[PDB]
Design a protein around this ligand. Structure first.
Ligand SMILES: Nc1nc2c(c(C(F)(F)F)n1)C(=O)N(C[C@@H]1CCC[C@H](C(F)(F)F)C1)C2
Ligand SMILES: Nc1nc2c(c(C(F)(F)F)n1)C(=O)N(C[C@@H]1CCC[C@H](C(F)(F)F)C1)C2
Ligand SMILES: N[C@@H](CCCC[NH3+])C(=O)O
Ligand SMILES: N[C@@H](CCCC[NH3+])C(=O)O
Lengths: 501, 501
């Protein structure tokens, strides 16, 4: 583009001519919001020539009325302000009027000095005496996001989106608000925030494939964490009683509308809680947050974008419970075979997958067959926030056995609109079984399950030091933001999401 | 150890005998702190047989004073409570007294039921009627950390440290407190907290060697971030005006008393600030925090451990400023040669390193020679919090040129006791020079500097959209905690630090 070359040329001319070239410091008198608060209610035509103010922003508009009168719009911190540059007021010590204003283009970051007030037409304005070019824009911008080559530019160059699109800026403000709310909830319960390692010698705590890396000086290979769970439980052994962590997990898997290779998770571990206690807590925390944000527990969601259909999601507590196996058996019209991890049941589940046209997993472990069936028959029933509960042990290697139900565990997942938000259980604290389930997992891994985790002997050793009865819990913050902010694409709620190259 | 085998054997016997085996849920009447608050001031010998309470904790002591009377200490949430188990009071429906208490060992997590009050000797106590084994400890514990095989166990098995050492628990409480204080500081200034990616296609923003990894589905190699700087500055282009991030950096380098391959950094970017503004902010923030924690700006530090010498560090503002080159030239007793990146000056600086017995760097870039000299002559003068300022451009590729001093930049580092805490500058916002400095860096990388960063074209493109005059800043949280908590080893302030294997 000729535009970019010419701008570099202009800037060189400016520098060689000793005119202001990327000034180090511009001292604003106040923010534009603070300016609008102070002068926004004056009478039309008001002007205070006894007050000289410095304002700065990005130029969004340039209109000349004549050779002697120029109108700018500047924008900063969510506030627009009009600048009215009259040659009569121009401070000649900063250069000839025409020269000073010839250096300014739309998109430029500029400073102005002058007198506060309002135009006769009633527009909040600064009656300028000078202009300074602080940081030029070397590209022709559109006036809105619809003027971009394509809408993927919004993600590859988020600065453009944030520049031009208020709706985008609002998502990240809301993200901050929601996380404050969540921290505060747990802070008031006497929780302690902790940081456990993102570099792991052994990955674990989730069904996910890891990123791999290497620490050269210590000549050891490492994994990025898929979850902090195995570390956090050790803190409960250590007696910290109530801990939470909020931070990135890394999952080496495909991207789509609800997946990004890194995302923000929260986990908490609470000693002496069980999964029943955690369901109540989840309801209180999430319903509270929804209410804080929306003023109501019934909120809009647009699955197919903002001009498509609108459904209502009802966060009124208590939420529906679906029992994992029973709901699968309702869909099937007959019972799964027992034991659930028997060859008999693996075969049966394969048969049922073919019959109901469900894509089979690989490998064909009982765990992954159960997961496919739950995805078809149960997750699809979860429009309003719903708990799927009482997952089989065979797919729940870190969850404590159900106190009433054989083969099951004290686990729940929270689904909203068929997407998983939370995953929680009464924590397994018996090390003999834990070692056994880790072995079954390593066996699955060797059989080609890329989401099965290796044995962690250090974790087993920690359990041998006595983990109190404990309840644990994780939440995908980003998917939560998708619901609160009404977005159907993860890329909307992460500043710099991953993209195909 | 026979002990571990026998405990597994006991637990099997318990299960086969139908006795309580890892109960799922134990409902406490109140916390131990709450128990101490309620019954701590009763008269000696008080007992309320009309109130039955459930308490739980980890057993820290077992004294059988006779065949009929056992004294336990349990500990939980920073509170010890004595249990007095009299055969006279035992609920026989839970088993024979001797049988019930034979299942309990030091280190066990246990529940007790009984009557609140105080012993005749005046010890806060529960007069128990039952005991439940909730989670046994299968290993013989010491009573304090000095009873561990070696003191590195504290780090390889942090649960033991946290179990046994109050001072350890205090560090991580203080860590949480300090980060709350810091977030609050910036929150009240109208900052927005953000998350930028830890998986990067191009690493940048610091002198550090990166971890390397690979995203299989997108068939692309990735770096873990060494700093969020290049992303964060794009948010200022986008107009967010004030942003901070608190989160892990990853640096693939050797470990020692002040280095860990991952650590917690905070960066913030404030539009319209310069490095002068940032020095004032740093003083206010850190002096405030010190005062909050210590009740004074003068605090103790033990560089050689708790039985060694003690220095006093004085955080009284304003802090000393040392000009980088001038202080080096004072130490040398002559001037560096100009330009600073000339072959003449490289040679000179090599000569001076040999003369003053300073370990040479590899490769021998001007930047790294300057660093070694600053390490010898300037960093060593920084006992009390001190700013080193006005670093050469050649070692400061993202810092804006000094407005007065040729070849220098508007940068500072904050040092306390010769260790770096902060690094900050008036941000370079001129894309022509930025591209040039990135080229010099890539050239250094190709010459074998593993801490030099490649060119980031996407960042250059962002600068071409106009970065406002901006001030940026980073802080090593963990090193700060070392000073606040008086620890001379990074491993003290990170829950699960890296270890040689
Ligand atoms: N690759 C990937 N994987 C997951 C998620 C994401 C993303 F970007 F959408 F945020 N990307 C997510 O939100 N997930 C829900 C899980 C539901 C249960 C709790 C966990 C937890 F604990 F990690 F937060 C997340 C998976
Ligand atoms: N490998 C490594 N490197 C650094 C640090 C650490 C550790 F473990 F101590 F935390 N380990 C640290 O604290 N560093 C100070 C820097 C001082 C200036 C600001 C930066 C920043 F940006 F990361 F905050 C940290 C380096
Ligand atoms: N680690 C789980 C969340 C916590 C489960 C309960 N301990 C996950 O990533 O899904
Ligand atoms: N990225 C720097 C901190 C910020 C420097 C100022 N932009 C570091 O890691 O030391």
């Amino acid at each position: 583009s000729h535009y970019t070359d010419n701008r570099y040329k202009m800037m060189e001319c400016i520098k060689d001519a000793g005119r202001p070239f990327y000034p180090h410091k511009f001292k604003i008198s106040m923010s534009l919001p603070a300016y609008a608060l102070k002068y926004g209610n004056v009478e039309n035509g008001y002007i205070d020539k006894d007050t000289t103010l410095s304002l700065s922003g990005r130029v969004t508009s340039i209109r000349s009325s004549s050779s002697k009168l120029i109108f700018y719009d500047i924008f900063c911190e969510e506030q627009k302000v009009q600048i009215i540059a009259n040659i009569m007021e121009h401070d000649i010590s900063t250069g000839e009027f025409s020269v000073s204003h010839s250096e300014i283009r739309r998109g430029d970051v500029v400073g102005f000095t002058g007198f506060p007030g309002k135009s006769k037409r009633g527009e909040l304005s600064l009656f300028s005496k000078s202009v300074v070019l602080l940081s030029p824009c070397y590209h022709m911008l559109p006036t809105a996001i619809s003027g971009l080559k394509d809408q993927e530019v919004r993600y590859r160059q988020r600065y453009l989106d944030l520049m031009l699109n208020e709706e985008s800026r609002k998502v990240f403000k809301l993200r901050s608000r929601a996380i404050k709310y969540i921290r505060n909830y747990f802070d008031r319960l006497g929780f302690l925030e902790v940081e456990t390692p993102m570099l792991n010698m052994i990955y674990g705590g989730a069904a996910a494939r890891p990123f791999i890396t290497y620490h050269n000086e210590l000549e050891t290979q490492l994994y990025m964490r898929i979850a902090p769970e195995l570390y956090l439980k050790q803190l409960i052994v250590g007696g910290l009683d109530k801990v939470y962590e909020i931070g990135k997990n890394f999952r080496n898997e495909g991207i789509d509308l609800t997946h990004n290779p890194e995302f923000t998770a929260m986990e908490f571990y609470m000693a002496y809680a069980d999964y029943y206690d955690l369901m109540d807590l989840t309801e209180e925390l999430i319903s509270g947050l929804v209410l804080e944000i929306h003023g109501s527990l019934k909120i809009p969601y647009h699955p197919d974008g903002p001009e498509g259909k609108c459904i209502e999601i009802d966060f009124t507590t208590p939420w529906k419970r679906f029992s994992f196996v029973e709901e699968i058996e309702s869909g099937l019209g007959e019972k799964l075979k027992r034991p659930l991890d028997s060859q008999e049941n693996i075969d049966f589940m394969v048969e049922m997958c073919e019959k109901h046209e469900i894509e089979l997993p690989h490998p064909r472990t009982a765990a992954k067959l159960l997961d496919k069936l739950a995805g078809h028959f149960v997750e699809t029933k979860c429009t309003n926030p719903s708990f799927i509960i009482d997952h089989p042990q065979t797919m729940s290697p870190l969850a404590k056995w159900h106190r009433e139900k054989p083969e099951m565990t004290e686990r729940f997942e929270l689904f909203v609109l068929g997407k998983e938000l939370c995953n929680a259980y009464t924590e397994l604290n018996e090390p003999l079984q834990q070692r056994k389930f880790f072995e079954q997992q390593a066996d699955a891994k060797a059989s080609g399950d890329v989401e099965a985790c290796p044995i962690d002997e250090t974790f087993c050793l920690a359990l041998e030091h006595g983990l109190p009865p404990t309840g644990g819990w994780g939440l995908g913050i980003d998917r939560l933001i998708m619901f609160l902010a009404d977005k159907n694409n993860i890329k909307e709620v992460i500043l710099f999401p991953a993209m195909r190259n």
